[PDB]
């Protein structure tokens, strides 16, 4: 291998490979801590997070650290604590990577048979997979424990705007949890991105943690079956290709999850979603015209036209205008006004709360459908309104990363298959 | 042997005139369905209200249209991202009215092209060739996925996808420029550089090989070095050919990523009113003229009449 493909020489150098992976993990943790500190430095805890381009602080706030009712910052210290802890753990991990890369043994096969592995060995590496699966399950159970105990998580669907609350009865029903997986990925049904309550999220993480722990123990204590050996290519680049494909799929799923979901990504921190801004604009226009004394039942007034209300293709009362494309949006400030047949005519009048109007106006001002690469504004924009939604940044970046890692699946899978075949 | 074994060996047979393969088993019905529906819709289909309002547009023949202007209209804005198969529509005429054929064609065609790339890899593996043809074909299929899908996902409706036509394609490009300023985005820039470099490299490689092919490659390399100062250039024809393939493929990958970014509203650069004098008055630039053109396109695009 040449200089550029130099890392490819570390396929059989178990000690150096371990050191390099640990060093990259230390780099990841170092970025996490450093960017958390950077976002804490420029926070101004009197302004919404999505108006300052913060991504890590919404993640910490969703856990329920330093937040109150309506997504108000009680205190900023927990974010600084998290940044410091990730930073110091990153320093430790970097020292470990430096040691195991150079000072430590170059190959672990002979001195430490427990830590020695060969890519062709189908049992030791399955044990490694079991160990790290157990670690992932422990992390999921840690999240679940933080949910039910040791404080709560920020439920945005709580009445009055949403707040931090303790999940007491997570949805542990198998049918409800596993119906998301078979749910179609299209309009209305958003696969796993359509989860709308925190109970389902906590129950699903319970299920995935238990399954991961059980599968880790199983793969630890069971050799692969002969059909499994026959059906797969067993080489390091093949495992790399499998990981790349899976992680690219996860990247695409994360992109869609951040773009469309507002439950696991509260709108008070990440800003309104795509459909949310348009629905908020329609709601604000409707409430303004209703205050001015207009007939909101007949949209702008003609029954044959739809600007404030319209019949859905299936026969539901939905907002008029272009917002007909976003009639599947569900929001904490809009659900109380929605009856069985979509929006309720009676509930649309004399039932709109002031906080709902404030949230609708705020989300209308900051539309993710307006963004011009750190300059903001809707469509053709000149200046001002410097708002690019963090949802847009997350979606674009992780979509690009997922596509690149799918390309990695293609490249490494082809190379591994050719090498195994002998080409 | 058994019928199942005979069918399997026929499918995997490389002695056929056209290789089928297991990926092709899924490819062929999808592509044939998409082709048949596209032909039928293009030749004769009722007008489709793409905007969702009761103002249909006729893009099919037999309705006052020709090949150049003809297209398959994207589905209605009322449907949005909803899955709209035939059985979910109230009636066949109502299905045609809302633009269902576009969704059927795009779904079966995307499945077909994915299975086509899979089949390309399958044949490359069966013949013993190195499997870099599939990763090269991954770029046009990525662009097709970003154009026909992803972008409707980001915009929230399939009516924003590119129509299956010529004039429809031009209209889609103009509206995209109006809404996102794709020209100033660095990734359409990278795609333009990629295709221009692909054409340049193709022309030069063809000329050099045709001149060298007589009745030497080192003579061609010396000529290239004398022309432009690349006496070193590549180590051999291996690096030359790999770079030859990599340039357009990387360009198309980057332009697909860019279109995805505009799908999630991450638009290109805008330097409107970026130059001011001491008094604060705005000094115009070329970007301001581009902004004026975008304003015209956007105001004429907004059919806010119904």
């Amino acid at each position: 291998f040449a200089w550029w493909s130099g890392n490819a020489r570390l396929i059989n150098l178990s000690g150096k490979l371990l050191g390099a992976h640990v060093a990259h993990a230390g780099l990841i943790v170092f970025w996490a801590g450093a960017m958390n500190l950077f976002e804490v430095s420029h926070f101004v805890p009197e302004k919404p997070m999505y108006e300052q381009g913060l991504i890590l602080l919404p993640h910490i706030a969703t856990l329920g650290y330093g937040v109150g009712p309506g997504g108000e910052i009680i205190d900023t210290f927990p974010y600084f604590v998290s940044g410091v802890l990730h930073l110091i753990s990153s320093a430790v991990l970097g020292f470990g990577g430096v040691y195991h890369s150079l000072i430590g043994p170059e190959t672990l096969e002979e001195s430490y048979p427990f830590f020695g592995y060969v890519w062709k060995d189908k049992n030791k590496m399955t044990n490694i997979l079991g160990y790290h699966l157990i670690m992932l399950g422990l992390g999921a159970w840690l999240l679940v424990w933080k949910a039910m105990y040791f404080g709560g998580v920020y439920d945005t669907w709580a009445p009055g705007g949403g707040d931090v609350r303790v999940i007491t009865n997570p949805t542990t029903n198998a049918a409800v949890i596993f119906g998301y997986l078979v749910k179609s990925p299209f309009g209305g049904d958003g696969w796993i991105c359509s989860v709308d309550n925190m109970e389902d999220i906590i129950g699903g993480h319970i299920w995935i943690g238990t399954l991961e722990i059980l599968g880790g123990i199983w793969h630890i204590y069971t050799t692969p079956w002969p059909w499994a050996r026959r059906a797969f290519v067993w080489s390091g680049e093949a495992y790399l290709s499998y990981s790349l494909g899976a992680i690219g799929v996860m990247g695409f799923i994360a992109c869609c999850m951040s773009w469309f979901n507002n439950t696991a990504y509260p709108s008070e921190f990440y800003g309104p979603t795509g459909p949310e801004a348009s629905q908020s604009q329609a709601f604000t226009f409707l409430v303004r015209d209703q205050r001015l004394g207009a007939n909101v039942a007949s949209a702008q007034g003609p029954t044959g036209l739809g600007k404030y209300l319209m019949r859905s293709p299936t026969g539901e009362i939905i907002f008029g205008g272009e917002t007909m494309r976003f009639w599947d949006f569900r929001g904490p400030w809009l659900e109380p006004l929605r009856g069985p047949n979509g929006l309720d005519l009676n509930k649309l009048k004399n039932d709109i709360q002031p906080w709902q109007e404030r949230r609708a106006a705020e989300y209308m001002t900051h539309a993710p459908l307006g963004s011009l690469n750190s300059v903001g504004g809707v469509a053709t924009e000149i200046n001002a309104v410097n708002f690019v939604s963090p949802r847009s940044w997350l979606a674009c970046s992780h979509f690009c990363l997922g596509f690149f890692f799918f390309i990695g699946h293609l490249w490494h899978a082809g190379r591994a298959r050719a090498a195994a075949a002998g080409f | 042997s058994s019928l199942w074994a005979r069918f399997c060996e026929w499918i995997t047979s490389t002695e056929n005139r056209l290789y089928i393969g297991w990926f092709g088993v899924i490819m062929i019905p999808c592509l044939l369905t998409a082709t048949s529906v596209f032909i039928i819709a293009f030749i004769a289909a009722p007008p489709v209200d793409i905007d969702g309002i009761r103002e249909p547009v006729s893009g099919s023949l037999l309705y006052g249209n020709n090949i150049i202007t003809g297209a398959v209209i994207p589905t209605s804005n009322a449907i949005g991202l909803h899955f709209y198969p035939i059985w979910e529509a109230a009636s066949l005429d109502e299905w045609l009215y809302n633009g269902g054929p576009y969704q059927l064609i795009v779904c079966h065609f995307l499945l077909g092209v994915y299975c086509y790339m899979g089949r390309e890899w399958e044949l490359s593996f069966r013949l013993g060739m190195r499997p870099w043809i599939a990763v090269a074909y991954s770029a046009p299929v990525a662009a097709a996925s970003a154009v026909f899908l992803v972008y409707p996902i980001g915009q929230g409706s399939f009516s924003d996808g590119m129509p299956l036509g010529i004039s429809g394609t031009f209209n889609f490009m103009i509206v995209f420029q109006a809404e996102h300023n794709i020209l100033m985005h660095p990734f359409h820039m990278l795609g333009v550089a990629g295709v221009f470099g692909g054409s340049l490299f193709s022309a030069m490689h063809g000329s050099l090989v045709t001149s060298s092919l007589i009745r030497n490659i080192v003579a061609a390399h010396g000529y290239f070095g004398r022309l432009i100062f690349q006496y070193a250039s590549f180590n051999n024809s291996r690096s030359l050919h790999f770079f030859l393939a990599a340039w357009p493929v990387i360009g198309i990958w980057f332009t697909a990523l860019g279109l995805s970014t505009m799908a999630f509203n991450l638009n290109g650069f805008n330097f409107n009113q970026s130059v001011v004098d001491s008094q604060g008055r705005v000094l115009n630039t070329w970007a301001d003229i581009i902004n004026r053109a975008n304003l015209g396109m956007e105001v004429m695009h907004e059919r806010n009449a119904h």
Partner: peptide, 28 residues
């Protein structure tokens, strides 16, 4: 639409199961 839905589901299921069996027919 019921008959059409059943026919389409049957066709798709047949093709998908045939494809799965093809990758499960002596192909590593």
């Amino acid at each position: 639409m019921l008959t059409l839905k059943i026919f389409v589901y049957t066709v798709v299921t047949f093709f998908v199961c045939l494809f799965i069996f093809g990758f499960l027919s002596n192909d590593p």
